[PDB]
Symmetry: D2
Subunit: 124 residues, 4 copies
């Protein structure tokens, strides 16, 4: 269990802030603040992690979602990050993400961005 390793405040390469609690049962709960895009302040996130990872030096699989609606803005979109937690002196969460916007059926082909974020426990 990397419950203690995951729980806390993380920062990515864009200067976004991910604040998460890992539950003993595999839950992830917290808030996300994006440094970029159609976003202001904090947004709810929820997700899941592997609470019993392999003991062979592998990372810990996890993922989470943010819907980009809060009390300030609604960007009619949702991002999911999928990745793994790697513990140790320079702990990191290495992710790839999919960001889908609500679209008409005609525009569905251009609904989804893909990218990658790396989170660390220390900021830019």
């Amino acid at each position: 269990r990397d419950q203690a390793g995951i729980t806390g405040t993380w920062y990515n390469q864009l200067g976004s802030t991910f604040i998460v609690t890992a539950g003993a049962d595999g839950a992830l709960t917290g808030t996300y603040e994006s440094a970029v895009g159609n976003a202001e302040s904090r947004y709810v996130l929820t997700g899941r992690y592997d609470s019993a990872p392999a003991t062979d030096g592998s990372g810990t699989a996890l993922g989470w979602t943010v819907a980009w609606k809060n009390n300030y803005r609604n960007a009619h979109s949702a991002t999911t990050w999928s990745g793994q937690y790697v513990g140790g002196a320079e702990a990191r969460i290495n992710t790839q993400w999919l960001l889908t916007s609500g679209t008409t059926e005609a525009n569905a082909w251009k609904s989804t961005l893909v990218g990658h974020d790396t989170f660390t426990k220390v900021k830019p």
Copy 2:
């Protein structure tokens, strides 16, 4: 709000079963059973949706995660689906997904599968 539209039992093209409740506040909670892969029975899922979508015929953005650990198996992996709900006679959730396995740093380049699932309210 497509709270009522989203809530329920959905099936994809592989014969997997997604059982979800949509909360008024943007939460998604439920269980997932995969017809394929290193999986048996139900797994917890959690996610988020846009509870106030655009009124212009656009779909409703949403996403969710499953960590592939339950009481029967642990596949040391997590999938996130990102997509949109489209209401109407033939309601569907159109998704793309990222499935990350825990890996060593040496194998991280081959950690993540990508695919697409389409869910409907009626099964194969």
Copy 3:
């Protein structure tokens, strides 16, 4: 060798037209016309396929790129499709694609769309 199987005119679910020749050496050459987006008429494509696939009923891996510049328009973007050819009565090329736009460094996080196209030998 599915050189003969691949060579020809293919259509996707959007009504786009892919015209390709497969070389004995693994080359793919041809033109692409998109039914959607910032595109008009034909664009050059090039790519590669596995000219000696497994004999066990597996599909044939292949990919190709289009840069969205021709004599009519320049959309400062490029798409790559990655996928497999499946032969037989209802032959199909099943792909996932990445479409990158040129961006400033500040906007690089939103540079790349992801999607999926299925090509068949008969049109909508």
Copy 4:
């Protein structure tokens, strides 16, 4: 035209080597050697780039494919990279990639890896 900027030898974070020539007409031709996976020596690549990019500080969109068959091995797979070239003192090609394996129809859901490579003109 970043024909001169693109042409040359590039290295990614895995220690792979990409050797490319950019044509005046938008072509990319060359060889790829992977430091990882089911690969040995050089493989043919082909692709396309935007030969007339925006003059506003944007990167130059490009993509290319490798089919993982040469005279030494056949991995029954193909990778496509989609990304942009960014010129200047520390020139880089920032990419995301899709790697599809030939599979049976039953295994198609697990056919495609996704990742990201950053290429520079100087090696690890």
